[PDB]
Each structure stands twice: as C-alpha cells, then as structure tokens.
C-alpha cells in the first residue's frame, strides 16, 4: 500500500453520508445489503470530497475524532429521520384505513400475527417509494446534504440544539396522515354506523357474519377510489418535507 | 416511470383485489343474510348457525370458481411480468 | 462487548428509558394502530434525549473534553470528573425510597454524601425510579383515550350495535381528539418539563 | 465463539436466569404492552445480578484474582479454587429433589461432598431449580393482574358492553395499581431477598 | 469453514436436536410467552447434552485423547477409533426404518454389520429418528396445556365473556400447573431417560 | 473471496438449495414453531447433500483425485475433467425450458451438445430449475397442514369460540399427523428419490 | 480485504439483482432462509452471466495482451476501465448524471463521464437502486393482491386471529410456480439490463 | 403518586365520562320516551353541541398534560 | 410450595375478584331491575333507558367506592408481594 | 406440473376440508338448533345454555369420530406424499 | 407408537376436557336457567341480571372445586409425563 494517507484524511463526510443512508426509508430499509450501502456512501464521498475542508482528527485526545464522528452521525441520522417521518405519513394513513376495514383484531391480545401491515402498510409504502423515486426527491436529498457541508461543516461542528423540531415531528405526520384519508375514513365510519342501523332495526344480525364482509367489500372499493386522488394529495406533502430538510440543514 | 404509471399499476392491483374479494365473499355474505332470515323468522338468537353455512358456501365457492379465477390471476401476473422491462423506461 | 456496552452504559444513564416507555404506552394508548414503528419512535426518543441532556452534556464537555483536546490524560480520574455532573443529574430524579432501598440492599457502609459513591448502585436506583415515573406518565396520558373508548362503546351498544368493535370506530376519534388538542407538543413538553427543574 | 460461551457460563450459573424470566412474566403479567424492549430488562436484570452476585464475585476475586495479578499460574488449579465459591453458592439454592434426580441420572459413583464433583451435573440441577422458582415467582406476581383483568371484564360485560376488549381498558388500571403499590421496588426486593439468605 | 461446521456437528451428532426442539415445543406449549429467550434454552440444552454424553465423551477421551497427549498420531486412524464410540451410540437410537431407508437410498453395497460403513449415511438417519422422537415427546408434553387452554376458553365463553383472549388468562394456570407437577424435573428426567437404556 | 467461494459454488451447484428450501417451507408448514433454528436444518440439508452427492463425488474422486494424489498436474485440465461429472449431473435435472431460455439470452453461438461450453450459463439454469422444483415440493408438503389449519380454525369458530388462535391448537395436531404418517422419512425419501433417476 | 469485492458490487450488475431477490424473498411468503447466502451466490452467478460480454471485452483489450509481461499498474488499467465505463453509461439515467456533474462543479463534461470514473460509479448505483426498486415493487404487487384476498376472505369468514400470512404463503408459492416465476424474473432482470 | 392523587384524577375522568355520555344520550332517551328517531336525535345533538364539548375536552386534556410534571413529584 | 398453597393463593384471588365484582356491579344490576319496574308498569318495550341509568350508577359507584376499594387491593397486593419470598420455600 | 394439476390438488384439499368441517360441526349446529327449540318454546332469551351443549356435543363428536377421521387424513397425506415425485414432472 | 395409541391419548385429553368444562360450567348454566325463570315470571326482558349471578356462581364454583380439580389434573399430567418414555417405543 503505502498510499492510505489522503484517503483516510477526511473520514468525516463518509460517516455523515453513511448515517444518512442507514436511516433513510428507501436506501436503508434492509432490502439493500449493508455492503452496498457502505460502499455507495464511500463512492458519494469520493465524489463530494473535493471543495470541502477537513479539520483532521489525527492523533490527540486518546480519541477525539470520535466526538466529531458522533456529531456528524447525529446530523446525518437527523436528516434521515426527518425524511423518514415523511413516509410514515402514508404508512399511518394506510394503516388507519386497514384497521377501520377490520384487519386489526390483533390489537387487544399481543399474542398474534399483529395488526397486519404487510397487507396495506407495505402497499402505501410501495406507492410512496415509487412516487418519491420518480420525483427529484431521492436526488434532492443528496443535493441537500451537499449544502450541509457548507452550513455546518466540520470542526466545532456547531451541531445544534434544535432537535425539538423533529422531536415534534411525528405530530404533523399524524396530522398529515389524517388529511390523506379523511375522505376515506369518514366513509368507512358511515358504513359501520350504516350497518349498525341494520343491527338496530333487525335484531340477531350477527355482524361478525355480515358486518365485516360488507365492510371489507366496501373498504377495497374505497381504497381504490382514494388511490385516484393520492397523487394530487401527495404533491404538496413531499414539497413540505423537502423544505423541512432544507431548513433543517441550511439554517444554523 | 411516471407517477401516472404507478397509479395505473395500483389501479390494476386494487380493482383486481376488489373484484376477487367480491367474487369470493358475496355468496357467503348472502348465505349469512339468509341465516339472518332464518333467525328472524323464529326468534333464534344464535351465534354459529350463521357461521357454518357461510364457511361451507365459501369453500364451495372456492372449489367452483377455482380454475378460472386462477387463470385471471395467472395472466394478470403474466401481463405485469412481461411489461416490466418496458415500463422501467 | 462494545455492542452491549452502548445501551447499558449510555442509554441507561439518560432520559431515553422513560421517554421510550412513554412513547410505547402512547402508541398503545393511541388508537390500536401499531407502526409508529419503534424505529422512528427510537430515533425520536433519542433526539428528545439529546435535547434534554443538552445541559448535562454541556457540563460534561466543559469539565472533561475542553481540557482534554490536548492529550492530557487517558483512562483515569478525568473519567470521574466527568462522572460527577451526570451523577448529580441522576440523583436529581431518583426517588428517596429507591436510593434507600439500594443502600439497604448493598449493606456495604453508609456513604456520608447522599450520592452513592459507586455509580453501579446509583444507576439501577435511577432506572427503577425511572420506570416508576414512566408508568406514571403513561397512565396519565392513557386516561383520556380510555375515556373516548368508553364513550364510543357506550353509544355503540346503546344503538344496539353489537359486534362492531367500538375500537375500530374509536381509532379515528382517538386520532382526531389527539390532533385537535395538538397531541405531541403537549406530550413532549410534559416529558421535557417533568424531567428538569423549571 | 465468545457470544456462544459468555451467555451460558455467565448467565446460567448466576442469578440472571431467575431475574429476566420473572421480568418477562411481568411484561406479560402487566398490561398487554410489549416494549420495555427486553433490552433494558436484560440490562436491568444484569445490574441486579451483579448486585446479588456481589458476595460471590467478592470471594472469587479474593480466592483467585487477588493473588493472580502477579503472574502466579495460568489455566490450572486456580480455576478450581475459583469454582468452589460459585459451586457452594449454586448448591445453596438448588432444591434437594433436583440434585437427587441428577445424581440418579448420572449413576457414576456416590460422591458424598454436597458439591457435585463435576460442575456439569450441578449446573443443570441449578438451572432447573432456577426455572421452577422463577415460574413460581412470576406466577405469584401475575395473580393480581389476573384479578384486575377479570374485574374489568366483568364490569364491562355487566354494563352490557361487549367487545370493548377489556384488556385495552385494563392496561392503565394495571399500570396504576402497579405504581401505587410501588411495583418495582417491591419486585426487586422480593427477587434480591428470596435469592439470598437473609 | 470449520467455525460454521462445528455447531452443526455438536447438534446433529449429539443429543442437542432432541432436547432443544422439545424445549422449543415447551416454550410454545407453555404459556404464550416468548423469552425464555432460546439463548438460555440453548445453553440449558448444551448442558443437558454434556451431561448425557458424559459416558460417550468419556469413552472418546479413553480411546482417543488419553493416548494422544503424547504426540502419537494426527489426522489419521485415531479419528476412526474416536468415530467408533459415537457411531455405536448413534446406532443405539436410530430406528430400524431410517437405517433401512438410507441403505436403500444409498444402494452402494450391502454391509453385514448393522453399523453403516460411512458416517455420512448414518448421521442423517440418526437425525431423522431424533426429530421423530423429539416431535413425539413435544406433542406428548403439549397435550395437557391444550387441555388447560380449552378449559379456560370454554369457561370464558360460558360466562358470556367473549373477547377476553383466553390465552392471556391461561398463561398463569399453565405456569401453576407446570410448577405443581414440578414441570421441569419431569421433562428433563424424561429426556435423559428416554435417550439411553436405563 | 473464500466466503464468497465455498457457499456460492458448492452450495448452489449441489442439492443444497432445494433441500434447505423444502425444509424451510416445512418448518413454516409445520406448526408455527421456529427453532428448528435453521442451523440443525442447515446441517441436516448438508448431510442430505453429502448423501445424495455420493455418486457425483465418487465420480469426481475417480476422474480427478484418484490420479492426483501423485502430484500430476495443478490448476489445469484436470479441473475440466472434474467439471464434466458435475456438469452432466446438473444437466440431468435442469428443465429443458430453462436451458432454452438461457441459451436464448446468451446469444453467443449455438453449442451442438446440450450443455453450453461454459458453466456460468448452466449454473443459473440449474439454480432456477432447482428453485422451481423446490417450491413445487414445498407447496405439495404444505397442503395438508393448511387443511388441518382450516379445519381447526373452522371448528374453533363453529364452537362460537373465537380469539383462541387456532394455530396454537393446530400445532399439536400438525406434529401428531406428521409423526403418524412418519413424516420425515417420507419427505427425505421424496427429496432423494425425485432428485435422481430411480 | 473488502476493497476487491466492493468494486464488483458497485460497478457490476450485482446491486439491482440482489435487491430484486431481496424484494422477492420479502415479496414471497414471509419466509426467510433463502438465507441471503445462496441469494448472494445466485445473484453473483447471474452477474457473471450478464457481464459475460463486458468481461469478454475487458479480457480482449486488457488481459489478452497482458499475459506477456507487457506493462503493470499503468495505462492498461484505463484500457480496462473503458469497456465497463461505457457499459455503466448505457444504464445510468440522465438525471443522476446531470446531478453529479452539478455536485462536482468541475470542468464541464456533458459528453461521457469523467475519466476518473469516480463520479459515474455513484450515479450508476443510484440509478441502479431506482430501477431495482422499480422491478421489485413490480413483482411485489401480485403477491400483495394475494395477501389482501387471503386476509379479506379470512376476516369475511369471521375467522380472525389466523394470521393470514401463514395461509397466504402456499398460495404465493403456488402462483409463483404456475406462472413459472423464476424464469420470468431472471429473464426480466437479464433482458431489462442490456439492450435486446 | 400518593394514591389520593390517583383517586382524584380517576374521579375527575369518571365524572367527565358521565357528563359526556349523559349529554349525548339523555336527549335520545327522552325522544324514546315520547315514542330511527333516536339516531336522528343523536345526530342533532352531536351537531348542536359541536365545538363547545370538544373544547371542554380539549381544555381537560391540555390541563392533564400541563399538570403531569407536578403530579409526578 | 405445595399444591395446597397454590389453592390458597387462588382462593384469595377468586374471592377478592368476586367480592370486587359484586361491590361494583350489584347497584347497577339493581338500577336495571328498577328500570325493569318502570318498563313493566307501562308497557314501554325499550332498549336503552335500561342502559343509561345502569352506566350512570356504575360510574357513581366507582367514584364513591374509589379510595377504600383501592386500599383493599393495595394491601392485598402488598400481602402477596411481601409473602412471596417465604412461600417460595 | 400444469395449472390443471394445481387445481386438482386444491380441489382435493378443499373438498377434504369442507367434509371434515361438516362432519365435525353439523352435530354441534343441530344441538344449537335444538337449544333454539328450547329457548323458543318458553321465552328464555338466554346466551349460554346454547353454548354449553354445543361444546359438549362437539367434544363427544371428536371422541366418537376420532380414529377413522384420523385414518382418512393419514392416507390422504400418504397419497400426497407418495405422489409428489411423480407430479413434480 | 401406533395411531391407536394417539387415539388413546386424545380420548384421555378430550374426556378430561369435557368433564372439566361440565364441572365448571353446569352450575353457571343452571343459575342462568334460574334467572330465566325469574325473567319469565314477570316479563323482565333484561340483559345482565342474567350475567351477574352466572359469574358469581362460576367464581364460587371455582373456589369450592379448587383443590380436587387441581389434584385430578396434576396426576393426569403426572400419568402422561411418567408414561411418555414407555409409549415412545
């Protein structure tokens, strides 16, 4: 060898981009093997490594570059989580619909299959992964991260104490989730109540027998109907989430 | 691949799912409504003579429908897996 | 042992545990839905933990790392000089009963200071008082969701609507009543306030 | 390798097996809630184990490691000198029936010393007694939560309110009753008391 | 590669697979609980395997290791002389049907002695017989817990109390019944007795 | 490259894939149980591989090793003479449709003999054919356990007794049915019989 | 040690293949233990079969003349870089290339990628993950249909708590056998990869 | 927690449940005393009550949360 | 620990459960019997003026009983959790 | 293996399942109809004297049927597991 | 182990289960029939004065039966777990 002196000089942006890729919803969802992700981040870092300063950790304070690596891992994981709650918006929307259809009788035991999310949660997650990938989304994040090294680059790092923002994160996620399925949810509710009137009008209507087949037949239809609007409902949400990333890194 | 294409695909999937579920379930739902008839004629407030006929009719419906439902699904799957390399780009 | 070292040494001596337990109770207290996924729940709890440990870690950096950017000392007393602030922080929240219990169950020798001279008797006391407080907060935040479950179920059986599983109806009501009351600013503020002395 | 060896030797001869299992029963005995994560339960039980093993490890350090900071011997009789205290400790809690059963199933020779000449026949008897006693304790600490569950279900069913799933309603009641009786100091006390001779 | 091979060896050529599987069935047969953790179950099965192979390992050390502390031979016939005891032992427990089936599917050449000239045809027959016997034992030790489950579910439904999840109410009755009959000493004695000729 | 060498070459070119996949489809087809641990399953698949690859390895040691205990050649044509047996063996089992597909997708030159000149076009063919056959066998052995599952669930529902998790009641009926029909010798003989030309 | 396997995952076909197979293992019944150790080997054999023309050209231009002690650690390495370079260029989407030229900010190269190849590799792997997730969800959809039909039939049977994944696994396997399943997917991978 | 406090909170919550369920169900009870109607009365009651009941529950939830830190100890 | 001791414990548990359930429920049952009075005087075949008073009285009974029921349960739990290390062996 | 063969197999499975379920359940359903008789003669609007006899008759039916149902299933399983290597190809 | 032996074992299990369920449930069923008496004398069409006595009698029956039911089950379990190594082969 006798050449590994400049390749390990920076060593910091590698950790930042690795931390982003591990906590991202598409690149880092365990369908990609860790070798691919690690070496992908290595490639991205030999791309972006020009035009950035270094602040070497070389050898002082038995390990101090470890403090600095912790700083950068925190920043990158913050990015990843900030745009992960974005996908969890649609995860939560799909799962509210799935539960209301009647696919969540695994709740009040916890010996069970679980509230089946592979059936609907994976469905909407695939929706969003596709749409996100076809938008500039998967790309803009990278651009965002580049500007990161010019707003809070390295050194003192000026990490931040703003975590509160993304700690308040899931809130709007829940909120956003509602505004996606509100036209569906209400419908389902009515159906339930509608069927309820039947049970009130004619007794001995056992509605493990009749209630849930009807609710599922109509819930699939309602899913198909809301899937029409899903795109025009999605478009502003991605904009808001990418601006959230933009201000999370560009500010401070 | 455009978001429009993703919506195309999920409309295929969801319409196929809802038509399969209707085809499989509606006879069981109707037999449930008929045992509801029976329990409403005489005040038989029972819990399981409403489940057994529904299961019997569901299994009979599976057996009867069977091959042509499987064929519909097979060439839906074949359409998808033959069109993949085009809709990629 | 480095993989077992992280949670036990750091995640135990911090705010993480009561935050993550309150978040899990919430995920259960909330509509029956799962998948806030305990993968963004863990990240969210970790970032709350960092925001809350900001003053603690500031003191730690002041007294340990600020003089030790300069190759001063390695693996010796400075570790105790950094143990001091986190030890006092942990004392600030451990109940008197649990400290008394562990001093009784150790039987070594009455330490003069209220702080336990070894850390390994203060950390489990901290964790027990921590779980107690976390279950306190959890019961508290569960109360109104139980109220909504009861109200909806009462109305549902009151309309002769049996077998409709009023939890399936109460999930949207739960999340609506959880969003109108702003939900998460509240709960996260309660955690961040109950944790420190304001 | 090390992950194959450390768990068995260090968590089956020690108190860990009794503690963690009990805690797990707790996590089931308590409201249906999962996610005290069995990763803070593991660390908490590990601290309680190091805290109960304190006299045992003190005596091992005195009998083996105190003279062996001076390069005296390696991989010889010192290992048996260290085995003796843990052997007597394990014997103190192994039920007589289990030792009799294993001496019967080995059939080798009648060894009069209470400690089994091989640790390989005393350890399984200790682990079986540990499982039996941990199930005893976990069932004990389960009973009152079953009481709360049955009371809640009977009240709901008595309000004509079926299908409200009395378990989701019982969860905050279980948490409340488990906090008001101090919950965790109680159970840590029972473990650390029943395990040793007081 | 040997690192990945050895544990498969200690499982297939020894008692392990009969024990752990039974224990596994128990962890399912017993209350719905997980976390006896299959890491103390694995260690306990390893200890039972050592305790049961004590005579086999004794004969191995007699015929192989006792003369080979003096640099006698390496990687040669001594390995075969060590194969003979474990080979006869495995033969002691393979059902005749499995050996017949594997001699039939090998078709190489008929051997007069019951022992199969290759170890590689004997091991799979031993493993098949082992899994068959392990599932027999596991099902036998499952039956009574099924009885308790049906009893509790039938009582719950018989109080009109649907949707109480009889498994959650049955977990303590399972644990009590499994400690009153002594539970673990029974099953471990059954495993260690059915394994050899007593 | 040894870790990408051994398990890639010899665990795909031999019978390992279909056996291990059928055993996994079984472990899931059998009662919901995990912990046959996929480790004793990997070992049992490896020994069934050694047992089925017996004639192939015999021919390999005939045409390759038997003259090459005598330092004849190295890293040359003897490797191709060793590829010949495994190549024709693989050809004996790849479906015609698959070899057609891969000759079509290669487009290089129409090789006269059925096996294309290199192995890198036959191995993916063999693996796809093996996966298709393994899924055929796995589904075929799954069907009856699905029948038991549906019957047990239907009987639990028809007893008005839902929420009892028919999988936990079906696990013993599955194990019993899988022991009475002898279960394991059936499936192992099926693998080793459908594998080769009897 | 891990430097050599790295450049094979990034530059060659390995990434999208192993990703589609991981989707499958997940797309299929919940089953694990296709073990990702025979999936890695199967994807590596498919990588060899697909890189056959690329590796053929590499051996042509680099290794054929370099059995004869010609040159070492010099321009021959770039003569070997050229074929894999244009191969990767054939599949990187235009957007990723534009973006990485934008992020490098170096001398303008709208013509093919920068010679160091350092700014084509990540663009290739990004377009690779994109196309791999495309195909993955494409083959995942019908298994979702089966999951939903199974779960909705089971609930419509009033028969809950049966974990419809354990009942959907055999139907997934059956449908994946009837449509022949694996040849479809491997042909799709090896055809959508290059120009046909 | 000093169980007195827990009983206090539980009494508060039970009284709120009583208030809400009464306000919602008593009008239907009266209209059923006079006589599909009762469901219509429930709908009318929901709409006519509307914001102020949700606002009182919002006040109570806000109060619970804003009080948690002190009730802990 | 003897099976006799296990029966002791479950007799504690079941007697506590039945007395708690009686204490909580019997007033609601009595108000149900009284609305049954009311519906029997005039032929009011109704379905929910029998549920509302029962729920109101159940919640009022919880509020009233409250602290002393909680105390009974607390020191039952305290008895159990203090006697565990003795009844172990 | 043809899709026709897959339909053959699933027709075996589903007919066996429906006949097993009928054999096991129909007596319980009939005893439920008979307790419905009893509750219809005198206006006993009850909820569980309709469950207990159904469970008793289900368990008695299992005990009685027992061995020959097990034999039917055993040699169905034996047919499947002996025909696998032929229907493979 | 013969299929005959498996049928032996399941006959043990199912007879024990049905006798346990009868012993535990029949008094509750009888108290339900008696509250049905009460609701049939005066036209009290009620829903829960039929559940409360049934639960009280079920818990009282558990408390009373208790030890000897536990003993029956204990030595059934002991019979099974002592006979396992013989019925294996």
Numbering used by the authors:
A (entry chain F): 10 to 261
B (entry chain G), I (entry chain J), J (entry chain H), K (entry chain I): 1 to 89
C (entry chain E), D (entry chain D), E (entry chain C), F (entry chain B): 53 to 250
G (entry chain A): 55 to 250
H (entry chain K): 1 to 35, 52 to 89
Paper text:
Type-three secretion system (T3SS) are multi-megadalton protein complexes that are capable of bridging from the bacterial cytoplasm to the extracellular space. Here we present the structure of the TM region of FlhB bound to the FliPQR complex, in addition to the structures of the FliPQR complex from Vibrio mimicus and Pseudomonas savastanoi.
We determined the structures of both complexes using single-particle cryo-electron microscopy (cryo-EM) analysis to 4.1 Å and 3.5 Å, respectively. Furthermore, our native mass spectrometry had also demonstrated that a small proportion of the P. savastanoi FliPQR complex contained five copies of FliQ, with the predicted fifth FliQ-binding site beginning to encroach on the predicted FlhB interaction site. Consistent with our previous native mass spectrometry data, the structure of P. savastanoi revealed an additional FliQ subunit in the complex. In the P. savastanoi structure, FliQ5 binds the remaining FliP subunit in the same way as in the other FliP–FliQ units. In fact, the hairpin composed of FlhB helices 1 and 2 is bound to the site occupied by FliQ5 in our P. savastanoi FliPQR structure, packing on FliP5, whereas helices 3 and 4 pack on FliR.
